[PDB]
C-alpha cells in the first residue's frame, strides 16, 4: 500500500520551508471575513447557508459502493460510538451546531479542521472544531503536514496529523489528531496553495455598497428638508416682515387661520417651493446590482431575498458545495472502509414532493427488479 | 474576476457532485475480457473512491475539471504497485508541468518542477509493461482537449480563457469608472449662493438658518423667511443612478457566461437541464471519463458515472422510464439498455 | 470637495457668499458603448451562419 513518496515535493524544497508552523490563512483573509459577517447582504447569505446546512440529519451506515467486503468498521462498537459521537459531540455543542460553524468557515475560508479524542481502540471520545483564523499547520520533508498548531505562545499544543499518529493494529489512530480538510484550487499545491473562497470575488461589490449606503445616510440628514424658500424685498420695514412671516406662517394644521389663503396688501412677495426629491439617496439601481452579485457569488437564486428555486438553491449549492465536502471529508478518516458517515436527504423539507413523485412513478416500471427501484431512491435494503 | 470565479467554481461544483465506480462496458465485444485480474479492478474501484491520503475523489474530481477549463489540460500520476495494482492517484499541477518529446511523435516524460526536485514521470507510452500490457511502475497522463491543425500535442490550448479578454477588460473598466465616481462625487444639494453685498456677518445668519431646519433642529421643517437681499437656491440633481453602466456591463457578464457555456437564466428547472445535458455531460464528463478508461484498465471494462446520481435529471428519467414500459414490441433487456440499468 | 461621503461637512448645503460660482452637472451617459444594437445583430448572423 502506502508508497509515502507524492509528487507535492516540488514545492518544500524551495518554495517552502519545513518546521516553521505556517498559518492557514492570510490576515486580509480573515479581517475580510470579520466585517464581513457585520454587512446586510454578507451576513444574511452566510447564516443562510449555515441554517440549511445545519438543518440536514447525520448517521453512520453502510455506504453503496461496498467492494470491500473486509468491512472496515472495524469493531461495530466503535461504529455504534461514532453514531453517539455524531449526534452529540464534546459537552457545551450539539452536533447541529458543529454542522454550521463547520459549514461557516468553509463558506468564509475554504477549510475545514477538528480534533478528535479517541480513547484507546478507535471509539472516538468527542469532536472539537478549530478556529481556522489562529490555527498554524507545520510540514513533513515529502510533502504533507504533520502536526498543527492552535495558539501563539502560552498554549502551545502540536496535535499531529491523522497520517502520523500511533495506529491501531487494524489502521484506526491511539490518540488525538486533526483534520483540516481543505477546498482544491488551480496549480494543484494541495495544501501549500491559496484558499479558495467567494470572498475572494466581492471585494469590489462590498465596497461599492457601503460607499453607496455612507452616500444616503449621509444625505438623510444634512438636505434641509424645508418648502417654501419665501424671500421679501429690501424695502418692507422690517417689523411688518415680521408680521408677513407670521401671516405665512399661522397656517400650518392647528393653527388660528389654517388653509385659508394668504392676502399680501403691496410689496409683491416671492415664493418657490423647493422639490427636495430625495427619493434616490440610496441609488436604488447601482446598488440592487452589487446585492445581486454578492448573493449569486455565494450561489444563492435571487428569488430566495418560487419553490423550484428553493429546490434549486437546495440541489445546486448546498448539496455538491457544503455537504458532499463535509461528508467525504469526514467518511474519508473517521471510519474505515464499507462504513461512512451518510446524511437523510428526506430529511430536507424542499425535497420531499419530488423523493414522492419519483417514487411513485418509479413504482409503476415493471422491467427492474425490487432492490434497484428502492437503492435508485435511497432505501438500502 | 466576480463573474468568472462564479462560472468556475459552478463547472466545479456541478462536475464534482457526480458519483464514480468501474463496470462492465457496453460494447464489450472484448469477450477476452481486459479485467486482467479482477483485484486490479476492486483496488481501482477502491482508488477511485478514495485517491491518495488528504484527498478524496469528489476533489480531484473538482481540480480535474478546473483545471480542464482553465487550460484545456488534465494531467495525473499514479502508482501502481507491482501487478497492475494502483496504489493512489496524484492530479499535477498544469501551470509548471513540462513535458518531453520522442523522435517519432509522442512524450516520453514529464518534467515537474524548475530545479531542486526533477523527477522526469514516464508517460503510459514508454514505461515497463506487464505482460499483460498494464504498466509495473508510475507514469502519468496529460489529457489533452483537441484544436485545428491537429498537432496532438505541439498544439495551442483550446480554453474559454481564449476568447474573453476582450469583456473581462471591458468589465473591469467600468467597474473602475463606478467605484471612483460612488466616491468623489459630492453628495450635496442645494447650492445656494448669496450676493456680494450682505455683510459677511449676516450671511452667517442666513447659511444657520437654512441649515437649521435639518432633521432634529430648532426650526425644522418651517419655511425660510428672508427679508431683503434675495438669495437664489438651486437643486442638484446627483442623478448617480448609472455609475455601474449597466447595460453594457449585463453584456459583458452574458458574454464571459455563455463563453463558459452556461444559460443565462442560471445566473426554468428546463435551463438546468440544459445546462447538466448540454455542457456539462458532453463538456466535462466524457472527456475525463474517456481518458481515465483509456489507460486505467483494460478493454471490457472502463470507469463510468451513473447519471441517476445528478438530482436534476431524476424526473426525466423516471418519466421516460415508464413510458418505455408501456411499449410491447422491444425485449426486456434492450429496455433496459436503453435507460441504463445494464443486465 | 469636504462633502464626498466620508468628509467634514458631508451631505450638507454649499454657501457661497458673493461671487456667484456656476455648475454645470455632466451627463456622461456612456450607457450605448458597445452599440447594443449594431452587435446583437452581427452576432445573430455569425450564429446562423453556422446553424445555430
Not at 516540488?10 to 508552523?21: C, E, L, Q
Not at 495558539?151 to 489502521?171: Q, Y
Not at 483540516?180 to 494543484?188: E, F, H, R
Request: proline share 6%; glycine share 8%; charged share 25%.
Amino acid at each position: 500500500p502506502a508508497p509515502s513518496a507524492n509528487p507535492a515535493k516540488i514545492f518544500i524544497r524551495r518554495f517552502f520551508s519545513a518546521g516553521v508552523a505556517k498559518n492557514v490563512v492570510s490576515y486580509s483573509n480573515v479581517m475580510a471575513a470579520q466585517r464581513a459577517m457585520e454587512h446586510p447582504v454578507a451576513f444574511r447569505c452566510l447564516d443562510k447557508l449555515g441554517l440549511t446546512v445545519q438543518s440536514v440529519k447525520w448517521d453512520v451506515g453502510k455506504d453503496p459502493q461496498n467492494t470491500q467486503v473486509g468491512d472496515g468498521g472495524m469493531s461495530a462498537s466503535q461504529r455504534k460510538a461514532l453514531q453517539q459521537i455524531l449526534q452529540r459531540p464534546n459537552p457545551t455543542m450539539s452536533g447541529a451546531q458543529l454542522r454550521y460553524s463547520a459549514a461557516l468557515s468553509w463558506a468564509c475560508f475554504g477549510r475545514m479542521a477538528f480534533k478528535v479524542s479517541v480513547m484507546s481502540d478507535g471509539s472516538v471520545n468527542a469532536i472539537w472544531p478549530l478556529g481556522i483564523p489562529f490555527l498554524k499547520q507545520k510540514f513533513d520533508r515529502y510533502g504533507d503536514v504533520e502536526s498543527f498548531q492552535y495558539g501563539d505562545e502560552a498554549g502551545k499544543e502540536t496535535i499531529p496529523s491523522f497520517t502520523k499518529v500511533e495506529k491501531n493494529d487494524k489502521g484506526r489512530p491511539i490518540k488525538n489528531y486533526a483534520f483540516m480538510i481543505v477546498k482544491p484550487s488551480i496549480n494543484g499545491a494541495m495544501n501549500f496553495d491559496v484558499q479558495n473562497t467567494p470572498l475572494q470575488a466581492i471585494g469590489v461589490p462590498v465596497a461599492l455598497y457601503d460607499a453607496l449606503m455612507a452616500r444616503a445616510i449621509d444625505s438623510a440628514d444634512g438636505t434641509p428638508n424645508s418648502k417654501w424658500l419665501v424671500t421679501a424685498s429690501r424695502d418692507l420695514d422690517d417689523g411688518q416682515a415680521k408680521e408677513v412671516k407670521e401671516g405665512i406662517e399661522e397656517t400650518k394644521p392647528g393653527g388660528d387661520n389654517g388653509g385659508e389663503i394668504i392676502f399680501i396688501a403691496g410689496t409683491d412677495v416671492k415664493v418657490q417651493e423647493m422639490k427636495n426629491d430625495l427619493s434616490d439617496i440610496h441609488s436604488k439601481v447601482p446598488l440592487d446590482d452589487q446585492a445581486r452579485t454578492i448573493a449569486g457569488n455565494f450561489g444563492i437564486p435571487i428569488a430566495l431575498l418560487y419553490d423550484e428555486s428553493r429546490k434549486a438553491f437546495f440541489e445546486d449549492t448546498i448539496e455538491p458545495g457544503y455537504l458532499t465536502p463535509l461528508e467525504d471529508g469526514f467518511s474519508m478518516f473517521l471510519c474505515g472502509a464499507g462504513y461512512r458517515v451518510i446524511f437523510d436527504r428526506d430529511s430536507i423539507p424542499a425535497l420531499r414532493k419530488s423523493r414522492a413523485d419519483i417514487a411513485a412513478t418509479y413504482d409503476k416500471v415493471t422491467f427492474i427488479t425490487e432492490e434497484e427501484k428502492r437503492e435508485v431512491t435511497g432505501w438500502p435494503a
